[PDB]
Amino acid sequence: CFLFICDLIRIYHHVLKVPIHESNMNLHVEPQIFQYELIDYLIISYSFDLLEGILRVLQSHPKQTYMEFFDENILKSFEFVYKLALTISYKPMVNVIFSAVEVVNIITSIILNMDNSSDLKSLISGSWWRDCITRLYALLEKEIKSGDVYNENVDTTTLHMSKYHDFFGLIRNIGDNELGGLISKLIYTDRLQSVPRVISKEDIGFTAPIIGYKMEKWLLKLKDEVLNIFENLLMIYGDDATIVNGEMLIHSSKFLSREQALMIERYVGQDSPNLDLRCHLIEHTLTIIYRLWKDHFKQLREEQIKQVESQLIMSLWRFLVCQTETVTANEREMRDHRHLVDSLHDLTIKDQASYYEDAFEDLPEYIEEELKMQLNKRTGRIMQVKYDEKFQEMARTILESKSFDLTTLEEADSLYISMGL
Amino acid sequence: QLTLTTSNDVFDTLLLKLIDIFNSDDYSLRIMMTLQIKNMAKILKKTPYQLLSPILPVLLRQLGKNLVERKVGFQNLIELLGYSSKTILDIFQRYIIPYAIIQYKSDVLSEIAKIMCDGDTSLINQMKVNLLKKNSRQIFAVALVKHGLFSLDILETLFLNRAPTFDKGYITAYLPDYKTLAEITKLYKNSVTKDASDSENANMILCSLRFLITNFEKDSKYKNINNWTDDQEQAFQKKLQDNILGIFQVFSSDIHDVEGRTTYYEKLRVINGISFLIIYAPKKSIISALAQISICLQTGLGLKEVRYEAFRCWHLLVRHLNDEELSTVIDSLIAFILQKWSEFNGKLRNIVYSILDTLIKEKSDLILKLKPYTTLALVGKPELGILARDGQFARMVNKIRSTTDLIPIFANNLKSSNKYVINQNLDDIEVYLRRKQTERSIDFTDITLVLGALLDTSHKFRNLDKDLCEKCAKCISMIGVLDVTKHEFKRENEVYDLNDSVQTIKFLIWVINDILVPAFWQSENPSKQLFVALVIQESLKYCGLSSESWDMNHKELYPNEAKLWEKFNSVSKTTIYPLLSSLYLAQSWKEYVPLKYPSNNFKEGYKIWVKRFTLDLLKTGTTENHPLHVFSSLIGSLSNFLLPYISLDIIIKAEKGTPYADILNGIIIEFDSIFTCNLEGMNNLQVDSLRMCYESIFRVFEYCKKWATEFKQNYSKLHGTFIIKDTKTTNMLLRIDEFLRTTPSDLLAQRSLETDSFERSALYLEQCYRQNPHDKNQNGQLLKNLQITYEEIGDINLVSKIEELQYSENWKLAQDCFNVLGKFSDDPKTTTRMLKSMYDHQLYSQIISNSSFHSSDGKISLSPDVKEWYSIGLEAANLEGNVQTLKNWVEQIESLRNIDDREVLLQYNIAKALIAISNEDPLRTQKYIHNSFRLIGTNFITSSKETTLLKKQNLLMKLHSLYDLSFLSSAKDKFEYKSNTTILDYRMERIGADFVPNHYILSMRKSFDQLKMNEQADADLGKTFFTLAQLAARLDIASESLMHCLERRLPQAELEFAEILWKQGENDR
């Protein structure tokens, strides 16, 4: 079935590879048809979720028997379909992008969880992970424009999942699945239809931008997937190859600092559902940078530590200007901050205590003493400060690792003096 | 973030401040800037080099002065820029080497040469010398600018400070090179205010201007004015007016820089250039600076981040050529501003406001007397605050609208070339027609010609710009059906030859107005604008006067060239007049590579073969005796025009005595060789290239034919007693004998219809079947082809003896002949014949009755190439059908897997618009109407010169219906809606009165309330069909619709039901 619907997706080359903006000659004069748009897209995403579930049968299958469902045919079919979906040149759709990158993710998960790993890591081609990660870095550098996520936006640098191609998916529900309602008009439901009832790209999609917010909370969790599987690649090789050649510092830290800059410049104050999930996961991508720069410190050479000395040093510096934290160190008004941004997670503490824990009603007095500071450093991690001492010294030791002259010793003082040291 | 907030100019100033906090001699400041810029870059969705190459020229200007020490600064810069040293070195040599040459004599150019040779030491000297040759222009500019001297001794000394290889004194004497004076006028780094240092650098760079080769051997230092003459200025600007054309072709070199590593710093540098020149340049220079200049800075203007500087130079041009002229190029600017004012910020907005108020304070005559659509547009997009800019001009714009029946000017400015100008054209078309519709005023009881202009825009977008196609299409839709009737749908112009003085001069006015402004006002390669210059020195020598001393009326000493340039249409005189002060001549001609090889004619088509072919035929047929000749260097833009346009020299084969008639026969058979190239079983490579060769040679034949016909008509008009008149009858009959001979009719017709055409075949075949047998026996092969070309063009055994009556005023019989022979539902050709027939007289609900879908199975599922039956039927449902009907087919048409079809996809879009307002969401029904409009306006119409709209019936009827389906502007309000019942009674005015589809008294009203059908308005749906059937022999359709309405008990509808029954023929029922 894996390879099967893979060749089916090569059957439906048209929709997965439709011109980025329908360049003049090519026209988006489509019959406004999630009718067959549903047919193609649905097949693709459903089958990609089936690829995820097949990986799962082997993923929880005993790793004494992992030499079988891996073959060059799996890899090559996925080559073609992955490349058809992550269409760097044409206008992809976000269900398929999700699904493909998820397949990449579980693939990597098993690339680790296979015991006799060297043989099958030889089997999967290094250039083939490379053609995964060129498109996956492409993803991470593609962005999220909520206000127009349900509208033809810029050249794929705006993950949209346009209402024109919009349902949930199977191990996950990212859209509104509005077009699931038009599956509640998918067939006549009163007739032996030969061809089915329209689903419509136009009819599908000031009402509930919670739609965009939950879908973006996904795309956020998507980039958690992406960071964690970039991270999983980081583990698949301890001694490594062309996929991580300092590029998993370049692009990884580029995302890490892009998210520092976006969380600061807008997202805190933008103070939305995304905040805490994003900050937890990008501090985690910081930790990815950390373990790369410590253990995988062997690979990184001058050319690429010079291509991105910038990002590296100053992302570490940004996280660093925090530890002393003479502001509150307690729950006085950093809880005001927990209200100005972490208000979403305040709704969550309320909901978990009043709706969503059998025991977290009538608190036993040893837990709110902890809450006052724990949720407070949660919102601090939201608001760029008071990251767990774990996090802060991770960020510090990434930079103050004088074993490599990432910092100039005569100016590390000018660096640190923004905080001390 | 301050940079992020700031726009264009201030943004770039702050980005330079940021690159300063970047090289601020500290790692901390260094790297903080590095992170914030890279984050800024790939969260601006740009690239660091793409955002910094805007300011990197300035940065390397400040850096080149101390590069040797600042290797660390340069390397930090390049690691942040992501690119290497070289790719910015060469892409910005224009502004890094010049400042590099004039620093301390211990220059860093040797080190830059060692940069070009890090893996070798070939010759520092040779890298230096080829580099200086590549940039030999701002180096002189700097040498007289960044240290200010023109005495030859130290002048050459500084040229050879570390560059001795610029030897032999000065290599070829182009100190007044087009490129030299470009790259120095580029240095016009002006600002808003007049600083002492900036003013003095501008004055001393113009001193560098006023030093050129004239004194580069016979030499003060040109750092002041005390060394300039008040007399040499007019010839000086003559030379500089030669200069300017190549100057701004170098401008287009930097702007339209195909390299890609280029950016917009060069574009604002070109802004500076044009500014400087028109500023210190007088009237002649600033008028010869009109043609390609608007294109150079409009390319600047389209770029977001030099829009500000673009309007700066645009405003100083506004100051630099007053109201009586330049009214050509306010269209581009009022268009760009009315078109992007939904973007324009505070600074862009107040500089454009300054544009406008200068326009009002100087050129009210230009705006309101010369281009009235400008006033109407600049008050038809009023949110820009144009009243808030002048206000009391509102009375003037009111005058402009009311005093003028302004349909023709609307057409002409609508006839303009590109998307932005026609974009505002059609926007105000919308507002105008809304005003006319709502105030029952659109003269309809030209508009038709602005209609045709709109559709010609559409077809120039036939595979282009879907969005303005849909705007264009809803504009044809809001203008209406139109079937001549009330007006006249209009479209070999004036007496021409190659013989006599004044008529060849008018042929040349045609030549200039139909080569320069179309394809040379729009040309983008500096080499070919230099060829533009060449051909128009040929032009201005054939109109050789006013090019030496003759003025407008300074002396009035002779009327000859005054009457020349006064017979000359003002666009022509203004577009080519200024060059008259340029005296340029061509070179010794190039090689030959002879002709008459059909092998290269097949493997070449039209890229070079027919063009060298035209080269030879001109250089042997006119030889400087005519303005034909030196166009000899068309080095492929105006191809299918000029290959014929130089194919009239035939007359000199009266008594040839030359190889010219020999090569005339040879060129005719070269065309027949292009014929013999007959698809050879190949692909697109044929179906495009030698196809357009086919239209090329059609135009050449149509061109010789038109020359002959005018040669006849004009010459005989006085009287008819000179029929022979010295061998001219022999020459004309001999040429037409050759034309009666050359006709490979079969291949001719085959490829003629291979191209989307009809008349080429029509006329060629007309003559060569004038040469036919009296009985039609040569017809067997070529009688199966006009009945396949007409089915698109529109000029529309037992089975072969049934359709005798088919459409002969009496359909019913042959019509059900078809519905029978297709009840067999097994022969598709006759099936389409059926549907199209019982379709033409609009039996649309029997068409949806003869549906293979609401049956034992759905219709022909996932309809392959046999979907044309859907094509014929969905419209049948789509106006005679409802929630149930439209839906049951709408979920039976999608069907295919690709979106290939166009007609049934149109009718699909509007079927799903109807089911959309079954769901009743009017706005996204307008969205499906956008999809339908885009579809028809892109994939459903072609150009004029083919098809009067009688056979675009389906198309324009569908268009009128689409507007009525979903358009909200004049009838957008609810108050409007009630009084629009009265205003729908006026839909016939715009559409017409033809029973085909133009009759819209209450027929289209039976659709207004059908689209607006909700509870009380759903009860009014059938009530609005009161005088709908007033039109209804072919009334089976009227029957179905009227049954639907009688389902509401409308007495008028019952009355018209009686009407249809009677019209069948009956009296007393």
mmCIF file with all atom_site columns, all heavy atoms in Angstrom, chain A residues 262-287, unseen atoms left out:
data_model
loop_
_atom_site.group_PDB
_atom_site.id
_atom_site.type_symbol
_atom_site.label_atom_id
_atom_site.label_alt_id
_atom_site.label_comp_id
_atom_site.label_asym_id
_atom_site.label_entity_id
_atom_site.label_seq_id
_atom_site.pdbx_PDB_ins_code
_atom_site.Cartn_x
_atom_site.Cartn_y
_atom_site.Cartn_z
_atom_site.occupancy
_atom_site.B_iso_or_equiv
_atom_site.pdbx_formal_charge
_atom_site.auth_seq_id
_atom_site.auth_comp_id
_atom_site.auth_asym_id
_atom_site.auth_atom_id
_atom_site.pdbx_PDB_model_num
ATOM 1   N N  . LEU A 1 262 ? 11.177 36.815 15.853 1.00 0.00 ? 262 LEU A N  1
ATOM 2   C CA . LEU A 1 262 ? 9.737  36.958 15.667 1.00 0.00 ? 262 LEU A CA 1
ATOM 3   C C  . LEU A 1 262 ? 8.988  36.958 17.000 1.00 0.00 ? 262 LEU A C  1
ATOM 4   O O  . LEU A 1 262 ? 8.125  37.815 17.222 1.00 0.00 ? 262 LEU A O  1
ATOM 5   C CB . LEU A 1 262 ? 9.217  35.888 14.698 1.00 0.00 ? 262 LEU A CB 1
ATOM 6   N N  . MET A 1 263 ? 9.327  36.044 17.918 1.00 0.00 ? 263 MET A N  1
ATOM 7   C CA . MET A 1 263 ? 8.665  36.036 19.218 1.00 0.00 ? 263 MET A CA 1
ATOM 8   C C  . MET A 1 263 ? 8.820  37.380 19.903 1.00 0.00 ? 263 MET A C  1
ATOM 9   O O  . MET A 1 263 ? 7.834  37.945 20.383 1.00 0.00 ? 263 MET A O  1
ATOM 10  C CB . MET A 1 263 ? 9.197  34.892 20.090 1.00 0.00 ? 263 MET A CB 1
ATOM 11  N N  . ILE A 1 264 ? 10.020 37.959 19.862 1.00 0.00 ? 264 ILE A N  1
ATOM 12  C CA . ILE A 1 264 ? 10.243 39.264 20.466 1.00 0.00 ? 264 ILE A CA 1
ATOM 13  C C  . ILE A 1 264 ? 9.505  40.339 19.687 1.00 0.00 ? 264 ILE A C  1
ATOM 14  O O  . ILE A 1 264 ? 8.572  40.962 20.193 1.00 0.00 ? 264 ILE A O  1
ATOM 15  C CB . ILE A 1 264 ? 11.743 39.584 20.522 1.00 0.00 ? 264 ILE A CB 1
ATOM 16  N N  . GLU A 1 265 ? 9.888  40.537 18.432 1.00 0.00 ? 265 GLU A N  1
ATOM 17  C CA . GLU A 1 265 ? 9.410  41.691 17.697 1.00 0.00 ? 265 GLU A CA 1
ATOM 18  C C  . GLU A 1 265 ? 7.894  41.717 17.615 1.00 0.00 ? 265 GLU A C  1
ATOM 19  O O  . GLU A 1 265 ? 7.298  42.797 17.641 1.00 0.00 ? 265 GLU A O  1
ATOM 20  C CB . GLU A 1 265 ? 10.031 41.691 16.303 1.00 0.00 ? 265 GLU A CB 1
ATOM 21  N N  . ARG A 1 266 ? 7.247  40.559 17.492 1.00 0.00 ? 266 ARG A N  1
ATOM 22  C CA . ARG A 1 266 ? 5.794  40.565 17.476 1.00 0.00 ? 266 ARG A CA 1
ATOM 23  C C  . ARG A 1 266 ? 5.131  39.666 18.513 1.00 0.00 ? 266 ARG A C  1
ATOM 24  O O  . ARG A 1 266 ? 4.247  40.121 19.245 1.00 0.00 ? 266 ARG A O  1
ATOM 25  C CB . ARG A 1 266 ? 5.310  40.189 16.086 1.00 0.00 ? 266 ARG A CB 1
ATOM 26  N N  . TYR A 1 267 ? 5.555  38.402 18.597 1.00 0.00 ? 267 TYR A N  1
ATOM 27  C CA . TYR A 1 267 ? 4.635  37.365 19.062 1.00 0.00 ? 267 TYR A CA 1
ATOM 28  C C  . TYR A 1 267 ? 4.288  37.540 20.532 1.00 0.00 ? 267 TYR A C  1
ATOM 29  O O  . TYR A 1 267 ? 3.138  37.349 20.935 1.00 0.00 ? 267 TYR A O  1
ATOM 30  C CB . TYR A 1 267 ? 5.200  35.977 18.784 1.00 0.00 ? 267 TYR A CB 1
ATOM 31  N N  . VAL A 1 268 ? 5.265  37.906 21.350 1.00 0.00 ? 268 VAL A N  1
ATOM 32  C CA . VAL A 1 268 ? 4.940  38.406 22.674 1.00 0.00 ? 268 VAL A CA 1
ATOM 33  C C  . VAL A 1 268 ? 4.437  39.832 22.502 1.00 0.00 ? 268 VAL A C  1
ATOM 34  O O  . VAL A 1 268 ? 5.099  40.665 21.873 1.00 0.00 ? 268 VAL A O  1
ATOM 35  C CB . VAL A 1 268 ? 6.156  38.320 23.599 1.00 0.00 ? 268 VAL A CB 1
ATOM 36  N N  . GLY A 1 269 ? 3.261  40.118 23.048 1.00 0.00 ? 269 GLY A N  1
ATOM 37  C CA . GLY A 1 269 ? 2.522  41.300 22.647 1.00 0.00 ? 269 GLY A CA 1
ATOM 38  C C  . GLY A 1 269 ? 1.484  40.952 21.598 1.00 0.00 ? 269 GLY A C  1
ATOM 39  O O  . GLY A 1 269 ? 0.334  41.388 21.680 1.00 0.00 ? 269 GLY A O  1
ATOM 40  N N  . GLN A 1 270 ? 1.889  40.177 20.590 1.00 0.00 ? 270 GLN A N  1
ATOM 41  C CA . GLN A 1 270 ? 0.917  39.426 19.804 1.00 0.00 ? 270 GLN A CA 1
ATOM 42  C C  . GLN A 1 270 ? 0.205  38.397 20.672 1.00 0.00 ? 270 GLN A C  1
ATOM 43  O O  . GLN A 1 270 ? -0.896 37.961 20.321 1.00 0.00 ? 270 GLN A O  1
ATOM 44  C CB . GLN A 1 270 ? 1.619  38.763 18.615 1.00 0.00 ? 270 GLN A CB 1
ATOM 45  N N  . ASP A 1 271 ? 0.844  37.976 21.771 1.00 0.00 ? 271 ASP A N  1
ATOM 46  C CA . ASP A 1 271 ? 0.250  37.350 22.955 1.00 0.00 ? 271 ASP A CA 1
ATOM 47  C C  . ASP A 1 271 ? -0.951 36.460 22.647 1.00 0.00 ? 271 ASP A C  1
ATOM 48  O O  . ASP A 1 271 ? -2.063 36.717 23.113 1.00 0.00 ? 271 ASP A O  1
ATOM 49  C CB . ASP A 1 271 ? -0.085 38.403 24.027 1.00 0.00 ? 271 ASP A CB 1
ATOM 50  N N  . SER A 1 272 ? -0.716 35.401 21.873 1.00 0.00 ? 272 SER A N  1
ATOM 51  C CA . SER A 1 272 ? -1.723 34.551 21.247 1.00 0.00 ? 272 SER A CA 1
ATOM 52  C C  . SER A 1 272 ? -1.548 33.099 21.698 1.00 0.00 ? 272 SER A C  1
ATOM 53  O O  . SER A 1 272 ? -0.669 32.823 22.522 1.00 0.00 ? 272 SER A O  1
ATOM 54  C CB . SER A 1 272 ? -1.612 34.700 19.730 1.00 0.00 ? 272 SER A CB 1
ATOM 55  N N  . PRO A 1 273 ? -2.378 32.150 21.235 1.00 0.00 ? 273 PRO A N  1
ATOM 56  C CA . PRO A 1 273 ? -2.200 30.756 21.686 1.00 0.00 ? 273 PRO A CA 1
ATOM 57  C C  . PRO A 1 273 ? -0.822 30.189 21.404 1.00 0.00 ? 273 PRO A C  1
ATOM 58  O O  . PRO A 1 273 ? -0.348 29.305 22.132 1.00 0.00 ? 273 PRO A O  1
ATOM 59  C CB . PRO A 1 273 ? -3.280 30.000 20.903 1.00 0.00 ? 273 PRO A CB 1
ATOM 60  N N  . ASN A 1 274 ? -0.173 30.677 20.351 1.00 0.00 ? 274 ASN A N  1
ATOM 61  C CA . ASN A 1 274 ? 1.090  30.116 19.891 1.00 0.00 ? 274 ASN A CA 1
ATOM 62  C C  . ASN A 1 274 ? 2.207  30.259 20.917 1.00 0.00 ? 274 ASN A C  1
ATOM 63  O O  . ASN A 1 274 ? 3.038  29.352 21.047 1.00 0.00 ? 274 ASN A O  1
ATOM 64  C CB . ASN A 1 274 ? 1.464  30.796 18.582 1.00 0.00 ? 274 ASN A CB 1
ATOM 65  N N  . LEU A 1 275 ? 2.204  31.354 21.678 1.00 0.00 ? 275 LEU A N  1
ATOM 66  C CA . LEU A 1 275 ? 3.366  31.801 22.439 1.00 0.00 ? 275 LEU A CA 1
ATOM 67  C C  . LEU A 1 275 ? 4.112  30.673 23.135 1.00 0.00 ? 275 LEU A C  1
ATOM 68  O O  . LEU A 1 275 ? 5.287  30.423 22.852 1.00 0.00 ? 275 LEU A O  1
ATOM 69  C CB . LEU A 1 275 ? 2.927  32.809 23.504 1.00 0.00 ? 275 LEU A CB 1
ATOM 70  N N  . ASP A 1 276 ? 3.449  29.997 24.072 1.00 0.00 ? 276 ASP A N  1
ATOM 71  C CA . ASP A 1 276 ? 4.183  29.103 24.958 1.00 0.00 ? 276 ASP A CA 1
ATOM 72  C C  . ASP A 1 276 ? 4.661  27.872 24.217 1.00 0.00 ? 276 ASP A C  1
ATOM 73  O O  . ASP A 1 276 ? 5.790  27.412 24.430 1.00 0.00 ? 276 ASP A O  1
ATOM 74  C CB . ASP A 1 276 ? 3.340  28.699 26.164 1.00 0.00 ? 276 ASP A CB 1
ATOM 75  N N  . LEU A 1 277 ? 3.813  27.309 23.362 1.00 0.00 ? 277 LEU A N  1
ATOM 76  C CA . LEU A 1 277 ? 4.244  26.162 22.583 1.00 0.00 ? 277 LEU A CA 1
ATOM 77  C C  . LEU A 1 277 ? 5.469  26.528 21.758 1.00 0.00 ? 277 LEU A C  1
ATOM 78  O O  . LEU A 1 277 ? 6.500  25.846 21.817 1.00 0.00 ? 277 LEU A O  1
ATOM 79  C CB . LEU A 1 277 ? 3.094  25.669 21.705 1.00 0.00 ? 277 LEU A CB 1
ATOM 80  N N  . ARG A 1 278 ? 5.404  27.659 21.057 1.00 0.00 ? 278 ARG A N  1
ATOM 81  C CA . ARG A 1 278 ? 6.538  28.090 20.247 1.00 0.00 ? 278 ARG A CA 1
ATOM 82  C C  . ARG A 1 278 ? 7.784  28.308 21.091 1.00 0.00 ? 278 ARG A C  1
ATOM 83  O O  . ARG A 1 278 ? 8.882  27.930 20.680 1.00 0.00 ? 278 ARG A O  1
ATOM 84  C CB . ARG A 1 278 ? 6.190  29.362 19.484 1.00 0.00 ? 278 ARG A CB 1
ATOM 85  N N  . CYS A 1 279 ? 7.647  28.922 22.267 1.00 0.00 ? 279 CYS A N  1
ATOM 86  C CA . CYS A 1 279 ? 8.849  29.258 23.022 1.00 0.00 ? 279 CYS A CA 1
ATOM 87  C C  . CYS A 1 279 ? 9.482  28.010 23.617 1.00 0.00 ? 279 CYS A C  1
ATOM 88  O O  . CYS A 1 279 ? 10.710 27.879 23.622 1.00 0.00 ? 279 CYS A O  1
ATOM 89  C CB . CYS A 1 279 ? 8.551  30.272 24.123 1.00 0.00 ? 279 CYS A CB 1
ATOM 90  N N  . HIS A 1 280 ? 8.661  27.078 24.110 1.00 0.00 ? 280 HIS A N  1
ATOM 91  C CA . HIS A 1 280 ? 9.186  25.795 24.566 1.00 0.00 ? 280 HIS A CA 1
ATOM 92  C C  . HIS A 1 280 ? 9.943  25.096 23.445 1.00 0.00 ? 280 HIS A C  1
ATOM 93  O O  . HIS A 1 280 ? 11.076 24.632 23.631 1.00 0.00 ? 280 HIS A O  1
ATOM 94  C CB . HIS A 1 280 ? 8.041  24.913 25.079 1.00 0.00 ? 280 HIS A CB 1
ATOM 95  N N  . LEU A 1 281 ? 9.349  25.056 22.251 1.00 0.00 ? 281 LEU A N  1
ATOM 96  C CA . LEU A 1 281 ? 9.959  24.280 21.181 1.00 0.00 ? 281 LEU A CA 1
ATOM 97  C C  . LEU A 1 281 ? 11.168 24.981 20.570 1.00 0.00 ? 281 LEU A C  1
ATOM 98  O O  . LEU A 1 281 ? 12.094 24.310 20.108 1.00 0.00 ? 281 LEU A O  1
ATOM 99  C CB . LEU A 1 281 ? 8.904  23.955 20.134 1.00 0.00 ? 281 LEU A CB 1
ATOM 100 N N  . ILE A 1 282 ? 11.217 26.314 20.588 1.00 0.00 ? 282 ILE A N  1
ATOM 101 C CA . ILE A 1 282 ? 12.411 26.961 20.048 1.00 0.00 ? 282 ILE A CA 1
ATOM 102 C C  . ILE A 1 282 ? 13.517 27.029 21.092 1.00 0.00 ? 282 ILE A C  1
ATOM 103 O O  . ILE A 1 282 ? 14.697 27.013 20.744 1.00 0.00 ? 282 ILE A O  1
ATOM 104 C CB . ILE A 1 282 ? 12.128 28.356 19.463 1.00 0.00 ? 282 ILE A CB 1
ATOM 105 N N  . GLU A 1 283 ? 13.196 27.079 22.383 1.00 0.00 ? 283 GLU A N  1
ATOM 106 C CA . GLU A 1 283 ? 14.248 26.814 23.351 1.00 0.00 ? 283 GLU A CA 1
ATOM 107 C C  . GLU A 1 283 ? 14.754 25.385 23.204 1.00 0.00 ? 283 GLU A C  1
ATOM 108 O O  . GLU A 1 283 ? 15.945 25.114 23.404 1.00 0.00 ? 283 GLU A O  1
ATOM 109 C CB . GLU A 1 283 ? 13.747 27.089 24.764 1.00 0.00 ? 283 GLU A CB 1
ATOM 110 N N  . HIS A 1 284 ? 13.883 24.463 22.798 1.00 0.00 ? 284 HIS A N  1
ATOM 111 C CA . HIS A 1 284 ? 14.365 23.116 22.528 1.00 0.00 ? 284 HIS A CA 1
ATOM 112 C C  . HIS A 1 284 ? 15.254 23.078 21.289 1.00 0.00 ? 284 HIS A C  1
ATOM 113 O O  . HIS A 1 284 ? 16.233 22.327 21.248 1.00 0.00 ? 284 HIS A O  1
ATOM 114 C CB . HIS A 1 284 ? 13.205 22.144 22.376 1.00 0.00 ? 284 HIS A CB 1
ATOM 115 N N  . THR A 1 285 ? 14.922 23.849 20.254 1.00 0.00 ? 285 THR A N  1
ATOM 116 C CA . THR A 1 285 ? 15.827 23.888 19.111 1.00 0.00 ? 285 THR A CA 1
ATOM 117 C C  . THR A 1 285 ? 17.132 24.567 19.497 1.00 0.00 ? 285 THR A C  1
ATOM 118 O O  . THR A 1 285 ? 18.186 24.238 18.945 1.00 0.00 ? 285 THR A O  1
ATOM 119 C CB . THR A 1 285 ? 15.188 24.566 17.889 1.00 0.00 ? 285 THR A CB 1
ATOM 120 N N  . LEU A 1 286 ? 17.088 25.498 20.452 1.00 0.00 ? 286 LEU A N  1
ATOM 121 C CA . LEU A 1 286 ? 18.318 25.954 21.088 1.00 0.00 ? 286 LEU A CA 1
ATOM 122 C C  . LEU A 1 286 ? 19.102 24.784 21.656 1.00 0.00 ? 286 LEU A C  1
ATOM 123 O O  . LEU A 1 286 ? 20.323 24.704 21.490 1.00 0.00 ? 286 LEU A O  1
ATOM 124 C CB . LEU A 1 286 ? 18.015 26.944 22.206 1.00 0.00 ? 286 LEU A CB 1
ATOM 125 N N  . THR A 1 287 ? 18.418 23.884 22.362 1.00 0.00 ? 287 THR A N  1
ATOM 126 C CA . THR A 1 287 ? 19.110 22.735 22.935 1.00 0.00 ? 287 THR A CA 1
ATOM 127 C C  . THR A 1 287 ? 19.672 21.840 21.840 1.00 0.00 ? 287 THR A C  1
ATOM 128 O O  . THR A 1 287 ? 20.711 21.192 22.017 1.00 0.00 ? 287 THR A O  1
ATOM 129 C CB . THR A 1 287 ? 18.162 21.956 23.831 1.00 0.00 ? 287 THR A CB 1
#
